[PDB]
Structure 1
Amino acid sequence: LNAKVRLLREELQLLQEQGSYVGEVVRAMDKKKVLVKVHPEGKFVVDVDKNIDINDVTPNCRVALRNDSYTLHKILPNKVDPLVSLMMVEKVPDSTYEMIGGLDKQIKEIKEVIELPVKHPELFEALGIAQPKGVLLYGPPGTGKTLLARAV
């Protein structure tokens, strides 16, 4: 109980401290300095705090910077991956072979040319042929091209 109460009374005191900025690391320098873009304007180089291994501040990660004399003092949860954001914007509906129906030979061909090179890159090596890297899908609109690409 006493620890709880003391925690509250020090809470009132330590909540008046300046809030810490959040900036995205773009590149890590030597001598314990990191290039950080602080939201929404400003690109600084901040000395890392002596509690964070600079090896963990890999580019494109959110980090807290102390209010006065910006000092990376915490690695916040990583920002949404740019690819994740791009795919969320595009919103290609998720697909699977069971949702696909009526084009089984086409499933087989796309399976060969996509599945096998990445899963079994030894069949092609034994055959002596370069792994296929380009697929083109003929067909009128809405016949399952994007569906099959997403499913594979």
Structure 2
Amino acid sequence: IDINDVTPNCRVALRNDSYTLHKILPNKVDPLVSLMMVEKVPDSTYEMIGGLDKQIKEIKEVIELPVKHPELFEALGIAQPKGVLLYGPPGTGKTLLARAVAHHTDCTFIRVSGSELVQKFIGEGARMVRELFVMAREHAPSIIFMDEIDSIGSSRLEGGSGGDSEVQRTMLELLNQLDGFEATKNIKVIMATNRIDILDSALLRPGRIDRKIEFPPPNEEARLDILKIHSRKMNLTRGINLRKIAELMPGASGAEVKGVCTEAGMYALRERRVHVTQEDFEMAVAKVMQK
């Protein structure tokens, strides 16, 4: 065997009597690349999503303009932002706006699940923020979408004197790779989260992150748009009159609409039909609203 081919983290065989390196076994997989964060061609909404028009203008003037106008930022001498924080009640344009922005800015969309399945091998997060960013640096001009979980992963360095569970170190690793040297280049990040006041954005404020955009509970127009989006991949009848279903329930979040569609499919299945009728949606609204 040869010394140079021996790397960190490769399985090797040791002999029985005296521990000498017998043969390098082949590795099985890199765990993060096995579960790799799926790059998609971004299927936008084509920006018809009403009600979030203020959010459309704000996300335009906040994140799109640095990508499209490096000349304006260079002429004005303004440092281009790196990250964008989003917050609000769940379901109110968490992932939809990022997809629409990514497709309209001519960039690919990357979604990072990364909640706890990565951190099972304790320090995989310390490589999760590494290799992901490597692909986001090597693939194309793109954006990175990352959820609340990092704030779930760490708040501050109280675990530095407490243990860090090798997760805050992960945050720390992300910290330097969030700082690095980009100046837009080809990689940008968008933060979507809830309960913003647990993480450590005061140190994250100089240079690393920038202006944050709120989200309200959805209006009737955004409710109908969410219902029309989530009724796409469903074999349904024509003439469903989704506006009637939109006015049928008074007011709710966007998370219950998905349950409305699945249990509407349930009630359609109990009718022993491939149809999804209007009365299925009426009983769907009634049963979901009940809970």
> Under TM normalisation by the shorter chain, which class is it?
0.3 to 0.5
- Higher-strand-fraction structure: 1
Structure with greater helix percent: 2
> Greater RCO between the two (CA within 8 Å, min separation 6)?
2
Q: Which has the larger radius of gyration?
A: 1
